[PDB]
Amino acid sequence: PTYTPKAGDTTRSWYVIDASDVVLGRLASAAATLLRGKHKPTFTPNVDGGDFVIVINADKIAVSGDKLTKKFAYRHSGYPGGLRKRTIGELLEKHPTRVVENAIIGMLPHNKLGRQIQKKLKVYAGPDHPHAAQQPIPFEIKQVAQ
Amino acid sequence: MKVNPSVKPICDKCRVIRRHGRVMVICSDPRHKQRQG
Amino acid sequence: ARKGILGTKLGMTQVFDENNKVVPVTVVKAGPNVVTRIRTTERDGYSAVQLAYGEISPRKVIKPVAGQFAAAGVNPRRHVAELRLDDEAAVAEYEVGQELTAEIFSDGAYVDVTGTSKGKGFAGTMKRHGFRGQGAAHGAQAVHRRPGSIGGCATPGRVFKGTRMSGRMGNDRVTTQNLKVHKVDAENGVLLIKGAIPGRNGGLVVVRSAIKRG
Amino acid sequence: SRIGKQPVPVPSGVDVTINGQNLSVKGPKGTLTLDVAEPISVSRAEDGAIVVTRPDDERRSRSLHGLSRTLIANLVTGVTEGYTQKMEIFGVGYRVQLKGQNLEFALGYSHPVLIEAPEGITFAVESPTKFSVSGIDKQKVGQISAVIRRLRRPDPYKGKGVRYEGEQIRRKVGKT
Amino acid sequence: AKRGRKKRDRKHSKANHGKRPNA
Amino acid sequence: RINAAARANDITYNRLIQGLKAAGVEVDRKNLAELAVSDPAAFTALVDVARAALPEDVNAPS
RNA sequence: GGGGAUAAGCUCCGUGCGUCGAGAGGGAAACAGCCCAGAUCGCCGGCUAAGGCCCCUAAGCGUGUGCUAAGUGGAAAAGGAU
RNA sequence: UCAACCAUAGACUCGGCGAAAUUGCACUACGAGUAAAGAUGCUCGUUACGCGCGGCAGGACGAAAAGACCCCGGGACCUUCA
RNA sequence: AUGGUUUGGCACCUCGAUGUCGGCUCGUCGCAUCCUGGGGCUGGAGCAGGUCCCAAGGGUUGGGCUGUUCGCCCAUUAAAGCGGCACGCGAGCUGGGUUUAGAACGUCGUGAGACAGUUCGGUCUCUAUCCGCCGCGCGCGUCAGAAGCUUGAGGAAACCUGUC
RNA sequence: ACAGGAUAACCGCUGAAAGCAUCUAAGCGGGAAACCUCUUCCAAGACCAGGCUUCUCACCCUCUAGGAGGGAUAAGGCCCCC
């Protein structure tokens, strides 16, 4: 029958993506792919068999057009008139990692397994990360050809 | 300034331009100033 | 700078100024406070000074607290509290073991007093939110103090969060701003502060320099 | 395009320097800098000049070509000759004086208007009703001179306000 | 009005082929 | 799973299926996935087979 | 085609026109009447339709030539518009 | 205006006895939508640790009463140059 | 052309019940801004305006008449905004009106009786299960157990204005 | 509140495309009770569940000693008590 992982088959690898001059959605799609495990042949949609994904230089993410000023990240407090919006530039200068996070989190499944997958995502605005002990492999975002 | 969808010249000095995504009309005579809106 | 101090509220009284105008003051036992820890950005991520106030027996102290006060290098106190500052240049003035008194302030200074409001218990919307009640006559069946409506109808279909309802009032941190100290009294170790102060008598307060008016 | 084709003649007292699109000029009046738009070719000619061209004919390149040429022209003529704007004042009581390097106007307000001189700019007062701004950047010069021009609301009924040297303001009449 | 407009313009989709129930 | 293993062998699922159908490999996707999990070398061999059987310009009408 | 304001998710007719009704399944975000297709049961086999192939989401961040700068796409008129 | 305070009976707490209407279910969120055109239950998202206590009454088109208004059908009683 | 607040058209949910006007209380939202704020043009001298644009942060009175909404009026005001939310809100209140049964006037009707005609009078039920909301606890967790002091992501509140 | 930042309408500077002109297409500025900061308050159930410190930082038993289970404790806390 068709393969299912059993309790020790989920191997974790650490990848690291330099988000310098990389397109936001491009990076986020790639990272969600790795975090979910679509790049793996052991992929089982009921399993977080994905890989850890570090993102560095999140502040240097590339955003096309006027999205830096006319795309808003909205948020609601639950209270009336509690809609607070903040552009992507405002968000980049305040909380740089939040744009990359939000992008990936939206590209991920909105479920309990998605929540479990978020934990493998580490995002850092500089070029440096503390997860060097884990020996992360650099991951260039390629495009398979045809 | 006049703000109307139909902005057009009023005299020979009124020049038409596209400024910041808006069709403006400029002139020495500031009465003839117009903007699309 | 924003120099400050912890103290105890003792009660209100009167004084008279040079113009023979009356000043309702509150007497704050701005007492011997002792510095017990310096908060820094290289250690704690923010600049602040930890003060301690209130005599206490060394047996009523929880032993962790005893160890904290010891490693600081002072004897224990009852209440401990931090004063946030703006920069390392502002925190560089406070040394551990340093003693703060009312004399850090001066007559005519404007202060902000942080205290803990008196408890009004489970309060109705009238006492708590200034709701007009309803009529005491003209037919009112048992709504003389009731809030009345609570939301819209089906279109909302819910009660909005943050609606003003009955519940516990008081025991909340209250900062009263821009109170002019009428007088310092270092002999007694108190401040005569023009006007109301939050909390009961014997309540702890924090008299800080006014963040608006110097 | 038609502006960008003619290069800029460099006088003697000039020291041009390039690392690619970037540009740094020096002259008697001071020094100046400019990072040229990428699609605009820049070269230092043999004939003591700075040639600037465009590879493509797209409207963006056609615009940036002429603009960059004008920018280098203003740059060199500012760092060699300087850029001046003479202003003058009209109306009774409407005056200016020099409080060091800053200026102080009286313009019928209840208070004096203190214009702080920014970096690179130097003011001067030929008279309480006639003054001037000088510098090396035409942009900053026009900027501060316009900040000065807009200090008072336009007064087309009696002309009370700041003007440029040869400015022909509009006017009206209030009869009643 | 907006609701009817949106519901009608939904029919201008590659799947619906310019027709929908109640248009 | 096939797409994953294929893109690990530097080929897309679609061109893999195309090449297998051109090579006359009637293997079903179940067994291809099982190979991808259990015999990646055999999967690579089939990928090579499919890449051979593909044309030289896949975006040409032929 | 009538009535209606050549409005109504309106009404009344016609149509070896359809579907729902009495019709599951796939697509249309969800969505009786639209598109595909008419479910005898089973299969951890394959090809397809409509529709789709960056991630959610299976399949293409497909190839080539151009266009678009408005996030147009991802609502709209007379009319305005180097 | 403009409401404040006091007591008492309840409400609250403890002990004891111990109902009720109601009830298709249930580990019963919010927004914008969609839908028998006003959604806890569908879609896309957002938010939300689990369980209680006191309270408020916006919704559950809440409970109650097979709408009395309207219409249809049938009665009853009343009137009269039926 | 917008909008969908008016009168309407349709009659699609609801007639084995979706309680109605107005007010009271509580609000919340939009901006098509009444004031405050910023500005362009003016047949804008100045005071004061007119018109248009931006702006919804806050504020936007009390009374006489009327059931009234609306409106008129009185005094004020910086201003006395327009609208939505089941013409917001009756398991929150009233019940003056409409809209039962009584009675009367006028009119109609032979009559019984009728009148978007008037008039006087005339039961407003419910111990809150769920969501929601206001507050308060219990449990567990935050990779030992505890304690003190804290950061502040993220939310809430506040944001008015005149006279001299 | 002051103050700052970024902005709306708007005022502009330098400037082409388009030998001029043009607030703009590259660039640079100014600019409102709106926005973000600032003020007050809640807040690490902020599941990235944080940080700075301090205290205890130690015993037995049973299963066959695998992973646990039970007990007694410390720091400390709770209950009773005022």
CSV table of C-alpha atoms in Angstrom, one decimal, chain D:
chain,number,residue,atom,x,y,z
D,1,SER,CA,17.1,63.8,-26.3
D,2,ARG,CA,17.6,66.9,-28.3
D,3,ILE,CA,18.8,68.5,-25.1
D,4,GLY,CA,20.9,65.5,-24.1
D,5,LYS,CA,22.8,65.2,-27.4
D,6,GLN,CA,24.8,68.4,-27.0
D,7,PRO,CA,27.5,67.7,-24.3
D,8,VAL,CA,28.5,70.0,-21.6
D,9,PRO,CA,31.7,72.1,-22.0
D,10,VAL,CA,34.0,71.9,-19.0
D,11,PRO,CA,35.9,75.0,-18.1
D,12,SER,CA,39.5,74.9,-16.8
D,13,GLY,CA,38.8,75.1,-13.0
D,14,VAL,CA,37.0,71.8,-13.0
D,15,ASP,CA,37.8,68.3,-11.6
D,16,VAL,CA,35.4,65.7,-12.8
D,17,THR,CA,35.4,62.2,-11.3
D,18,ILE,CA,33.4,59.1,-12.2
D,19,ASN,CA,32.9,55.5,-11.0
D,20,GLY,CA,30.2,54.4,-13.4
D,21,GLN,CA,26.8,56.1,-13.1
D,22,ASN,CA,28.1,58.0,-10.1
D,23,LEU,CA,29.6,61.4,-10.5
D,24,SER,CA,31.6,63.8,-8.4
D,25,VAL,CA,32.7,67.3,-9.6
D,26,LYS,CA,34.9,69.8,-7.9
D,27,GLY,CA,35.4,73.5,-8.7
D,28,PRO,CA,36.3,76.8,-7.1
D,29,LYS,CA,32.8,77.2,-5.6
D,30,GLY,CA,32.9,73.8,-3.9
D,31,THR,CA,32.0,70.2,-4.9
D,32,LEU,CA,28.9,68.3,-6.0
D,33,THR,CA,27.7,64.8,-6.5
D,34,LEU,CA,25.1,63.0,-8.7
D,35,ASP,CA,24.1,59.3,-9.2
D,36,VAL,CA,22.9,59.3,-12.8
D,37,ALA,CA,20.0,57.1,-13.9
D,38,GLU,CA,21.2,53.7,-15.0
D,39,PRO,CA,19.9,53.5,-18.6
D,40,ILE,CA,21.7,56.8,-19.5
D,41,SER,CA,25.2,56.3,-20.9
D,42,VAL,CA,27.8,58.7,-19.4
D,43,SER,CA,31.4,59.2,-20.7
D,44,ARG,CA,34.2,61.7,-20.2
D,45,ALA,CA,35.0,63.1,-23.7
D,46,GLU,CA,38.5,63.7,-25.0
D,47,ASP,CA,37.6,67.4,-25.7
D,48,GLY,CA,37.3,68.4,-22.0
D,49,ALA,CA,33.6,67.6,-21.7
D,50,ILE,CA,31.1,65.1,-20.4
D,51,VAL,CA,29.1,63.3,-23.1
D,52,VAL,CA,25.8,61.7,-22.2
D,53,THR,CA,23.7,59.5,-24.5
D,54,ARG,CA,20.9,56.9,-24.4
D,55,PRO,CA,21.1,53.4,-25.8
D,56,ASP,CA,17.3,52.9,-26.4
D,57,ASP,CA,14.7,55.3,-27.7
D,58,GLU,CA,12.0,54.4,-25.1
D,59,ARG,CA,10.3,57.4,-23.6
D,60,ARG,CA,11.9,56.8,-20.2
D,61,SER,CA,15.4,56.9,-21.7
D,62,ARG,CA,14.5,59.9,-23.9
D,63,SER,CA,13.4,61.8,-20.8
D,64,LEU,CA,16.3,60.8,-18.5
D,65,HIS,CA,18.8,61.6,-21.2
D,66,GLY,CA,17.9,65.3,-21.5
D,67,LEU,CA,17.3,65.5,-17.7
D,68,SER,CA,20.7,64.1,-16.8
D,69,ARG,CA,22.4,66.4,-19.3
D,70,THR,CA,20.7,69.5,-17.8
D,71,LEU,CA,21.6,68.2,-14.3
D,72,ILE,CA,25.3,68.0,-15.1
D,73,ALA,CA,25.1,71.4,-16.8
D,74,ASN,CA,23.6,73.0,-13.7
D,75,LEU,CA,26.1,71.0,-11.5
D,76,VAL,CA,29.2,72.3,-13.3
D,77,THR,CA,28.0,75.8,-13.7
D,78,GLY,CA,27.1,75.9,-10.0
D,79,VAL,CA,30.4,74.4,-8.8
D,80,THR,CA,32.2,76.9,-11.1
D,81,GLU,CA,30.2,80.0,-11.3
D,82,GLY,CA,27.6,79.5,-8.6
D,83,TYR,CA,23.8,80.0,-8.6
D,84,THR,CA,22.3,83.2,-7.4
D,85,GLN,CA,18.7,84.5,-7.0
D,86,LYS,CA,18.0,88.1,-6.3
D,87,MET,CA,14.8,88.9,-4.5
D,88,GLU,CA,13.2,92.2,-3.5
D,89,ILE,CA,10.4,93.3,-1.2
D,90,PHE,CA,7.5,95.6,-1.5
D,91,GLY,CA,5.2,97.4,0.9
D,92,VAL,CA,5.6,99.8,3.8
D,93,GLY,CA,7.4,98.2,6.7
D,94,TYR,CA,8.2,95.1,4.7
D,95,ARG,CA,11.9,94.6,5.3
D,96,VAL,CA,14.7,92.1,6.0
D,97,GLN,CA,18.0,92.0,7.7
D,98,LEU,CA,20.8,89.5,8.2
D,99,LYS,CA,21.1,88.0,11.7
D,100,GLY,CA,24.4,86.3,11.2
D,101,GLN,CA,23.8,83.9,8.3
D,102,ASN,CA,20.1,83.5,9.0
D,103,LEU,CA,17.6,86.2,7.9
D,104,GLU,CA,14.9,88.1,9.8
D,105,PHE,CA,12.0,89.6,7.9
D,106,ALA,CA,9.3,92.0,9.1
D,107,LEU,CA,6.3,91.5,6.9
D,108,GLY,CA,3.4,93.2,8.9
D,109,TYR,CA,3.2,90.2,11.2
D,110,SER,CA,3.0,90.4,14.9
D,111,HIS,CA,6.4,88.8,15.0
D,112,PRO,CA,9.6,88.6,13.0
D,113,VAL,CA,10.1,85.7,10.5
D,114,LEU,CA,13.4,84.0,11.0
D,115,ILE,CA,14.6,82.0,8.0
D,116,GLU,CA,17.4,79.7,9.0
D,117,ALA,CA,20.0,79.3,6.3
D,118,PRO,CA,20.5,75.6,5.4
D,119,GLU,CA,23.8,74.0,4.5
D,120,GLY,CA,25.4,74.9,1.2
D,121,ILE,CA,23.3,78.2,1.0
D,122,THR,CA,24.6,81.6,1.8
D,123,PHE,CA,22.4,84.7,2.0
D,124,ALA,CA,23.1,88.4,1.5
D,125,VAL,CA,21.3,91.7,1.9
D,126,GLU,CA,22.0,94.5,-0.6
D,127,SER,CA,19.4,96.5,1.2
D,128,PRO,CA,16.5,96.0,3.7
D,129,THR,CA,14.2,95.8,0.6
D,130,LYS,CA,16.6,93.8,-1.6
D,131,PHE,CA,18.4,90.6,-0.8
D,132,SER,CA,19.8,87.5,-2.5
D,133,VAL,CA,20.4,83.8,-2.0
D,134,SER,CA,23.5,82.1,-3.4
D,135,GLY,CA,24.8,78.6,-3.5
D,136,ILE,CA,25.9,75.7,-5.8
D,137,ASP,CA,22.7,73.7,-6.1
D,138,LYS,CA,20.0,75.3,-8.2
D,139,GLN,CA,17.5,73.0,-6.5
D,140,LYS,CA,18.2,74.2,-3.0
D,141,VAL,CA,18.5,77.8,-4.1
D,142,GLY,CA,15.1,77.8,-5.8
D,143,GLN,CA,13.7,75.8,-2.9
D,144,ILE,CA,14.7,78.3,-0.2
D,145,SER,CA,13.9,81.3,-2.4
D,146,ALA,CA,10.4,79.9,-3.0
D,147,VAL,CA,10.1,79.2,0.8
D,148,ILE,CA,10.8,82.9,1.1
D,149,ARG,CA,8.5,83.9,-1.7
D,150,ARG,CA,5.6,82.0,-0.1
D,151,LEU,CA,6.2,83.6,3.3
D,152,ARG,CA,3.3,86.0,2.8
D,153,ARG,CA,0.0,85.3,1.1
D,154,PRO,CA,-0.2,87.0,-2.4
D,155,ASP,CA,-1.4,90.6,-2.2
D,156,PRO,CA,-2.4,91.5,-5.8
D,157,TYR,CA,-4.3,94.5,-4.4
D,158,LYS,CA,-1.2,96.4,-3.1
D,159,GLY,CA,1.7,94.0,-3.9
D,160,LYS,CA,2.8,93.7,-0.3
D,161,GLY,CA,5.1,90.7,-0.2
D,162,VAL,CA,8.3,89.1,-1.4
D,163,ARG,CA,9.0,88.8,-5.1
D,164,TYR,CA,11.8,87.8,-7.4
D,165,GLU,CA,13.9,90.4,-9.2
D,166,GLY,CA,11.9,90.8,-12.4
D,167,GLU,CA,8.6,89.3,-11.3
D,168,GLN,CA,5.4,90.5,-12.9
D,169,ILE,CA,2.8,89.5,-10.4
D,170,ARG,CA,-0.9,89.6,-11.1
D,171,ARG,CA,-3.0,92.4,-9.7
D,172,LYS,CA,-6.5,93.5,-9.1
D,173,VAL,CA,-8.3,96.4,-7.5
D,174,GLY,CA,-10.6,96.6,-4.5
D,175,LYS,CA,-12.5,99.8,-5.0
D,176,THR,CA,-14.8,99.9,-2.0
